[PDB]
Design a protein around this nucleic acid. Sequence first.
DNA 1: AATCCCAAA
Length: 190
Amino acid sequence: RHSMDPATFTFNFNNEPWVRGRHETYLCYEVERMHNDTWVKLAQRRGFLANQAKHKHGFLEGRHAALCFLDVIPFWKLDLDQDYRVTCFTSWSPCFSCAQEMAKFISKNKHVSLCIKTARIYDDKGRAAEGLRTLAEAGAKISIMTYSEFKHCWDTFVDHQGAPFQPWDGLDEHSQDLSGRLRAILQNQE
DNA sequence: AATCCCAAA
Ligand SMILES: [Zn+2]
């Protein structure tokens, strides 16, 4: 569908750090090109997707959202001569294995600056922290989604039918708590 | 300390 279901958005992008029940991953993405020394939004290079769930017919092994995203980039046929900025708004941050695959991609495509903005930090059974450091080392800009970024995704990716963004309880405090943990992860303190 | 986990009951 063209726009995300609002209940799906609200459920999946809730940023209570230790909340239960989020066993899917959603990813919104947008692309900019550097032109006349400023980033310009590519209107048709944006969208959203979810993970291919384990046991889904036609993909019984599943496919994480980040991988599904890297899968669409070649079809953009990005000019190998231009600089691009690709921003992903992820409900869960990348697992170790998908962090490594994203790090390989930006190592191989130096004309792409990747920004990952995540609602929640995915622990990956203690393995994600080193994955995120490795992704940052490769040049990705990783941050915790804030109020204005949730609102941006509501306004521009969600099928809101005119309804304004309604922040959930604790959004800012959750964002700030996650930002401290992300900094600790990226500084190798966690 | 552990919480939490692109599910599994
Ligand atoms: Zn993954």
